[PDB]
Design a protein around this motif. Structure first.
Motif, mmCIF file in Angstrom:
data_model
loop_
_atom_site.group_PDB
_atom_site.id
_atom_site.type_symbol
_atom_site.label_atom_id
_atom_site.label_comp_id
_atom_site.label_asym_id
_atom_site.label_seq_id
_atom_site.Cartn_x
_atom_site.Cartn_y
_atom_site.Cartn_z
ATOM 1 N N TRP A 82 0.174 1.009 15.120
ATOM 2 C CA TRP A 82 0.836 1.970 14.221
ATOM 3 C C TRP A 82 2.348 1.780 14.223
ATOM 4 C CZ3 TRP A 82 0.601 4.327 10.041
ATOM 5 C CH2 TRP A 82 1.520 5.338 9.705
ATOM 6 N N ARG A 85 7.825 4.653 10.033
ATOM 7 C CA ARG A 85 8.832 4.178 9.074
ATOM 8 C C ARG A 85 10.245 4.396 9.615
ATOM 9 N NH1 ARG A 85 11.806 1.180 6.011
ATOM 10 N NH2 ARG A 85 12.266 1.907 3.881
ATOM 11 N N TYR B 79 10.847 5.808 0.892
ATOM 12 C CA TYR B 79 9.462 5.866 1.359
ATOM 13 C C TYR B 79 8.440 5.453 0.298
ATOM 14 C CZ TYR B 79 11.077 8.256 5.590
ATOM 15 O OH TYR B 79 11.675 8.587 6.788
ATOM 16 N N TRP B 82 4.859 4.377 1.244
ATOM 17 C CA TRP B 82 4.606 4.775 2.649
ATOM 18 C C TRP B 82 3.243 5.451 2.817
ATOM 19 C CZ3 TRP B 82 5.150 3.863 7.417
ATOM 20 C CH2 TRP B 82 4.867 4.834 8.393
ATOM 21 N N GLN B 83 2.469 4.972 3.786
ATOM 22 C CA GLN B 83 1.134 5.521 4.032
ATOM 23 C C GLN B 83 0.938 6.035 5.457
ATOM 24 O OE1 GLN B 83 -1.765 7.236 3.707
ATOM 25 N NE2 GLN B 83 -1.718 6.073 1.792
ATOM 26 N N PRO B 84 0.927 7.366 5.631
ATOM 27 C CA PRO B 84 0.737 7.958 6.959
ATOM 28 C C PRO B 84 -0.655 7.605 7.494
ATOM 29 C CG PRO B 84 1.783 9.508 5.495
ATOM 30 C CD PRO B 84 1.235 8.407 4.634
ATOM 31 N N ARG B 85 -0.763 7.477 8.810
ATOM 32 C CA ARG B 85 -2.036 7.153 9.444
ATOM 33 C C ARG B 85 -2.959 8.377 9.422
ATOM 34 N NH1 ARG B 85 -6.383 5.104 10.800
ATOM 35 N NH2 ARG B 85 -6.931 4.435 12.927
#
Lengths: 412, 412
Positions: A82, A85, B79, B82-85
């Protein structure tokens, strides 16, 4: 251990260059990391910055704290690879001061009970404590002058005690927890590890710019109140030996020491800490518990499975109890400057026990929010024993001054 | 607008199917997005879940709130993609309840002043307010029965008023901000947008499981204290027209209404909100400001640039003032059940003004932390005007009950 304050002075006079200081750290990490295993990731290319009060100061970052140039794996396979950003605000506080982020230190999975592979620098057959395992072990092994960790129970003070390093869990919320993997938002508090109290002071001064951390010097004849937290049960012999040794050293140093009882309201706060912690953990780790239940480390998986039924009602009641404890605790500080207590139940547990240690003597203070500082006192069987210096909320500077006083007192 | 409570009742009796309800939202979105632009992204494949009180309920999520299956772009180019887990805890609260995450609604860059492309559903030539622009617009355009947003200044109450939707900013920290892009950790509070107060209540019940949100009914003979926030400056005619309409309706409905001036301590708290907000924003957005300064949207970049000099000392003083303010506000609630005031300066500003509106009548309450609810009242020139119902901290239920009473009062 490496002293940040010492490096700062030598770099300031020009005796040591920032590049050399950083090379010192890389070399120190290289020298012991294969036996201690304190880093999840060591950035061998990390270089020194040219300016700032922390130029030339290498810092280890617990791996639940976001970094933009290195992975943040939360000590869990669920977050393998992981990559956040952005750098967490506390990491940026260090970078803006001119510090070098030399690597990510080990953290138990989501900062809970599951042991990491890190070993105690004083005896590799023992635990370095947790959950800030790597940060405490790295500083304790003389690899780096500073490291960040977090505390929800006693994840800062306990491992510091076990590894014999100075450390501080500042007043609740002084340092932002943005970019810090949450376990309990009512408890989570960023902390620092260093050689001595003065190193922590300089670290906090550079990170926050708060004048209260500027000009700190050892306290004089402090009024200390000794609390043994009987609500948490009796401590192991070694821990009491370290406390008795600290009290005597403080007295012979000119401090007034008196055994004090904690208000019933405070005892109750210690009791319900688990309710607040575990109820919030279920909300904070909802995605993990719902979508990756079996992938969560065993011990944490079990603790979560056993607390699914906690209700908003008992939660609110626990929070009310905690607020009453904070109020009455403040009263205790009207007659005493700092409290002196245990940092852990005793020496670090053998790795074979698969435990990072019982947080029972740390948890209350995380909920109360007071600044806590660990002071290394002695060693039993080669294993460090420390004491915990606690000041009133917002009196971090004084906690550090008294800790410094205690350090000098122990050195006689 | 679509009523969550309405859908729930019809689905619970079998009168309406969850799949039909979701198909309806997909239809509503497609019917007006080219006109309103309230979504950063719409997941057309989103389907209703099999169980839970929120099954068949489509929800829009402000794009600073983390989602695991859809990007979270913070309304900033920084962002993009941007891709959050993981899904933020508040998103999981909805998903665990059976809700359908239909898409991410537009947000100003990092939830600040920079306008999005979103337009007011009531008048395409006007702003829908901010920073929760998309959530307020989408709900106001009858696209979805529920939407999540956040409030630091008045990012929830203001756009709700501008778009004529019901909305609530619960008591501070009730809903976790974990996984929610931070602007100011002392202020950031998650909020909900719906058609009526009852819709907000059923939503909070499903998300939190708190008994206080179960069986809520319109309040009877509420004791209302009217505050015009003189310290907030001159309000626009339309706003006052709305407040008087609300007062008249409440009086006829049996409410006891009295005008009251807020304590000087509260006026002060209002003045220092910017200090707390902006000093913390520099820490919270440190990485963005230091590494991608020129990429930060114009208005936010300007406010950050003008406030780099804010010191920890004045920040601490501002927080002291904030605390004094909360203490004295509590006393005000000894004679009244709720406070009634403006939700915004007046009707929504024309898009040409490049302004999402001034949060001067919202910001104080975000700092105090009390639950705030917007109650649509009337429209001037076609643009909505609402009033803000505020209860004692921790009494969100009574705030929704009084808001409900007020809606019924206005309906004559």
């Amino acid at each position: 251990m490496i002293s940040l304050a010492d490096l700062q002075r030598r770099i300031e006079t020009g005796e040591l260059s920032p590049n050399a200081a950083i090379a010192q750290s890389h070399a120190a990490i290289e020298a012991r990391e294969k036996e201690v295993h304190a880093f999840v990731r060591h950035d061998k290319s990390a270089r020194a910055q040219a300016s700032g009060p922390l130029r030339g100061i290498a810092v280890g970052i617990k791996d639940i704290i976001d970094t933009a140039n290195m992975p943040t794996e939360m000590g869990s396979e669920i977050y393998r690879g992981w990559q956040p950003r952005s750098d967490a605000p506390v990491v940026m506080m260090l970078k803006r001061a001119g510090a070098t982020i030399i690597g990510k230190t080990t953290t138990t999975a989501f900062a809970s009970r599951d042991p990491t592979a890190t070993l105690n620098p004083h005896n590799t057959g023992h635990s370095p404590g947790g959950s800030s395992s790597g940060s405490a072990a790295a500083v304790g092994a003389g690899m780096i002058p500073l490291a960040l960790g977090t505390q929800t129970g006693g994840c800062v003070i306990r491992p510091a005690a076990y590894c014999g390093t100075a450390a501080i869990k500042p007043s609740f919320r002084m340092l932002p927890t943005v970019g810090v993997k949450c376990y309990s938002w009512a408890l989570d508090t960023v902390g620092l590890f260093g050689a001595r109290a003065e190193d922590l002071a300089r670290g906090l001064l550079a990170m926050t710019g708060r004048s209260e951390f500027s000009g700190i010097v050892p306290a004089k004849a402090p009024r200390i109140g000794v609390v043994r937290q009987e609500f948490a049960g009796a401590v192991e012999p070694a821990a009491e030996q370290g406390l008795q040794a600290a009290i005597k050293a403080a007295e012979r140093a000119g401090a007034s020491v008196q055994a004090i009882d904690l208000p019933e309201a405070v005892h109750e706060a210690w009791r319900i800490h688990p309710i607040i912690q575990d109820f919030e953990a279920h909300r904070a780790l909802a995605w993990e518990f719902s979508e990756h239940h079996d992938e969560i480390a065993p011990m944490l998986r079990a603790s979560l499975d056993a607390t699914v039924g906690l209700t908003p009602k008992e939660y609110d009641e626990a929070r009310r109890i905690g607020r009453r404890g904070r109020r009455e605790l403040g009263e205790v500080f009207e007659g005493v400057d700092v409290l002196l207590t245990y940092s852990a139940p005793g020496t670090a547990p053998a790795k074979a026990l698969a435990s990072t240690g019982d947080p029972r003597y740390n948890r209350l203070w995380t909920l109360m929010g007071n600044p806590c500082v660990n002071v290394p006192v002695l060693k039993v069987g080669g294993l460090p024993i420390g004491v915990q210096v606690i000041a009133r909320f917002g009196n971090d500077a004084h906690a550090l001054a008294t800790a410094w006083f205690l350090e000098d007192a122990l050195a006689k």
